[PDB]
What does this fold into?
Amino acid sequence: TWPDVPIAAAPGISYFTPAQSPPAGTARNPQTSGKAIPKLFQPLTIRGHTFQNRLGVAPMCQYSADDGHLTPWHMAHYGGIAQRGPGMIIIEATGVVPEGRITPGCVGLWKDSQIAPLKQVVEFAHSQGQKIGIQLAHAGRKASTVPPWLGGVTATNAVGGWTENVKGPSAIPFAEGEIVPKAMTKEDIEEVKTAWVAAVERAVAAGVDFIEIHNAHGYLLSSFLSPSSNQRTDDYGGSFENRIRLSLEISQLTRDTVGPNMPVFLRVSATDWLEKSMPEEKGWKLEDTVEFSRALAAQGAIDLIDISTGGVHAAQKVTSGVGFQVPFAKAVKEAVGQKMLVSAVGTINSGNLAEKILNEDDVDVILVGRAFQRDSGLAWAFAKDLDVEIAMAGQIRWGFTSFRSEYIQP
Amino acid sequence: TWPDVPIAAAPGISYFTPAQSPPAGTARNPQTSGKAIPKLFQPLTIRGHTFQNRLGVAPMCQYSADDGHLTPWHMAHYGGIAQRGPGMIIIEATGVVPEGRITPGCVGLWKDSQIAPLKQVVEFAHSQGQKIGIQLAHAGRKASTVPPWLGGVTATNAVGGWTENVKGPSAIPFAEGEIVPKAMTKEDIEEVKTAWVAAVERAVAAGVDFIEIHNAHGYLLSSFLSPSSNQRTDDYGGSFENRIRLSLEISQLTRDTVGPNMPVFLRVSATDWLEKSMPEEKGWKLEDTVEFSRALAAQGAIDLIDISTGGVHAAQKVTSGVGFQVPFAKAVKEAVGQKMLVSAVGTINSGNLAEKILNEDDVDVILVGRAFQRDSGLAWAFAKDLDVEIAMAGQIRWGFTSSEYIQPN
Ligand SMILES: Cc1cc2nc3c(=O)[nH]c(=O)nc-3n(C[C@H](O)[C@H](O)[C@H](O)COP(=O)(O)O)c2cc1C
Ligand SMILES: Cc1cc2nc3c(=O)[nH]c(=O)nc-3n(C[C@H](O)[C@H](O)[C@H](O)COP(=O)(O)O)c2cc1C
Ligand SMILES: [Cl-]
Ligand SMILES: [Cl-]
It folds into this structure.
């Protein structure tokens, strides 16, 4: 006596959940308003993948991993964001070796047991049509510390640390009183590259849509760049060519393992923020980052440079503020044009400023961090900031619309 | 060389996650600002349990369960809320029998396999210091329908329905053209009572902190109250006492089963909204809800009456607006003073308005629905609107300051 109305399910998974067609965060085309779609909510395609808008979740450590293994905290964290249509999600820094975690709570992928917890989270994200990738990491001489809400102080062995297995380019503590890392041997560098392939391979089995390389914030790769942390006298220190070499190798290796269709990102710290505080230190400035991005666009393996700053030197003096890292992303996009995409991140907390950055600075992707801890639906917020009628999950949307559309007029 | 700093873990569980001392959403007492803590952020104790503030997540159907089983959808939903410190979480309407779900995607607790999926979510919430309970339900003559984003129309058997196993007090479809429900036999009600007791035990086995009885919104118990849906001629129909009889039995059975320490809530539809649209209809109005709340206060089984409205009759005309069901809770609170707790729900979108309802309408709990689907961190939102310094998870809190507490303004 009634028509048959089925509930379409997400494909390829062992549990039922409703499918969202199109995925949450997709601008209706045509907009019901008749207005043009702002640059922020126009899809972007990198190699084999399409992101339905250009707002990404910046990688954010949760310090809640159990021997590198994801827990239901990460299902609640990443999954609540995934239900609300960001354009992409960058999973937090994930250790490629145990001594490459930052803290005892860091995610890791040095082990096959670590794949399936990550795979459960990726799988639910894709049940939502969301794109999810992972930032592989090696904390270097900044490894073995406690989470930041506990001050970020050294994690001793009694409390889970590894103060005797901390490795960097050179025997230089990050600050006085911090762990003196062991200057990595050539075999250590070869061991890190070897572990890097295994971690990339482990991520690929888990189903990630892209890989980001953590080359920023004074961790292992970032510290090879800076002559403040790198005083090696071999093929990996001294000259500018040598200090970007390991970063260049990891980029080729990472490309070579994922093939020609998978997006590969690299995040770098554009400056060490010593311009005023330590002007006589030959460190790492925007000029160095621009020459670095020139080698990476020339090399052709990395698709997107994620520009961050600082963490490279303890004496940094960070000039914070709204969008305080956009100037560096603007200059790097200027250096590489369309050969490389560039993303911006850092105190970008309105949709209007996000759109302003994409158009006036020619940035490709807008990443937001903290605000996604506060607003798991920040993509919902930025669309409202921009008045974009967007798609949202049928479970969420039906109480924000009339009794009788797949899109939300925010 | 270096001081020893361990990361305390949540106790009694097989996975590491940082412990939250105090649970998120706890107003610092005393506030560092010296200001007083509003009632919305004053803890609440019901029998064996203490809630760290009075903001609750109202029950909200997700229509995404797998043969009644919770999925990672529910861990992302409830668990993302749980990280952000509400005073309580009321899990959605949970069917006690298969045919008592609303839709094929509704949760259930008629079967033992459904406990462990529930237990993973309750166990993650409790890792955060969260209080979490469940709304048990039976969709009645409004059962076997599709989710609301697909129109809420009948679900035929071809798409997962059970159009021949839909039961209510009387064989009266909810609207014209809808499924004609089967009029329950004496055995039908006893099977519900048997099924209800078992579902309580399954909920208690899953570890919930409280149970709410869904007696609202035109589902099974709501349809027994209203003479529009209930024309029975036995102990469950006719007189007003007969129409509230089943609700009274169900509440005591739950009380006897959960023991003396567990809070038991009951949600009711305070009015059917037929005053203007069907004025000559003997239906269910606030005067009945007050006599029912008085009878439940006399009984002593239920600790909190969850006041809602509507869903009881198809021609309802709901005059909505900000705090639009607050008047009914205000009259019910007056009739039951301190013998029973009372909550209010409905288009309550700021901490300022919430506090206002608490203080001069004297309700005990403020429930919010939609606003939690948008902001899983609404407890943070209402704390800022009221300038209340609250505790927040160390994973969330450390990027908004240079303490365990966050000054939200
Ligand atoms: C809690 C938290 C965790 C973070 N984890 C990482 C990380 O694992 N890797 C990384 O490159 N940056 C990390 N960051 C830095 C952010 O990804 C981002 O670049 C920075 O927060 C941008 O500023 P915003 O959060 O104010 O938008 C983290 C930041 C926060 C607040
Ligand atoms: C998506 C959604 C699902 C709901 N599911 C239930 C439910 O299962 N049981 C119930 O008693 N009320 C349910 N409600 C009603 C809410 O609990 C609440 O009483 C009502 O929505 C008013 O809350 P609000 O105005 O803050 O959204 C639901 C509401 C929404 C929007
Ligand atoms: Cl970082
Ligand atoms: Cl409902």
